[PDB]
Amino acid sequence: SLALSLTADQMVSALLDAEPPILYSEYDPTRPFSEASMMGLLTNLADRELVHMINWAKRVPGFVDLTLHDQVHLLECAWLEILMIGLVWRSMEHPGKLLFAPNLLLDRNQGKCVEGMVEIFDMLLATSSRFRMMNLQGEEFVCLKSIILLNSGVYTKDHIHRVLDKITDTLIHLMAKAGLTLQQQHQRLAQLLLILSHIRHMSNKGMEHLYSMKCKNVVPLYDLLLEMLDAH
């Protein structure tokens, strides 16, 4: 694996350069949304984001070194967590709101338009607030997103574990370079990784909710999104 020889700086640069683009929601002035219109906008966006996520994953150091089977398994287990952490990240500039897209900034109240969605919106908003208060940096964010990709399905492996230690080294490197004391470094590292268990929790709750939305046929699901969902 070529990823194992990279320095912390090269690791960060690689991750920053692989970042996917910010997509726009389909346009439509009509407000408020209905349960179906809102879910229609969100699933359409999610489906397009998934295509970019796949290409982003291929640019994550060490991922292409895995077999197709393993690559598939990792994406299937982590896709919703990855979509969620991305949403939480771009929503940091907008306390109290979730920025699904530059032209689609939603509030908690708008989460009630879809049954069972307000509970998820609230967990996402709290996570964003938590990141905002920690003053999460873009460089730390890209490392966290990569850790989610490589760690989520790892137990369902020596190479992946070696790449994870690499990212850990990179995170500490960034904190040290930011001037944190040795103590502040390991405390911040723990704080960041603990939030990952909360992201995992939201993903499982979101997966459950999506499955029920599917059975309630609130709206037809795009093929790729359906594939990723059925994998669960």
């Binding site: 295509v51 796949i54 290409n55 291929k58 197709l68 690559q71 598939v72 994406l75 299937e76 093929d223 790729l224 594939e227 990723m228």
Partner: peptide
């Protein structure tokens, strides 16, 4: 099996 994911990954 045939997956859109498989196609996009390759």
């Amino acid at each position: 099996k045939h997956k859109i994911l498989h196609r996009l990954l390759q």
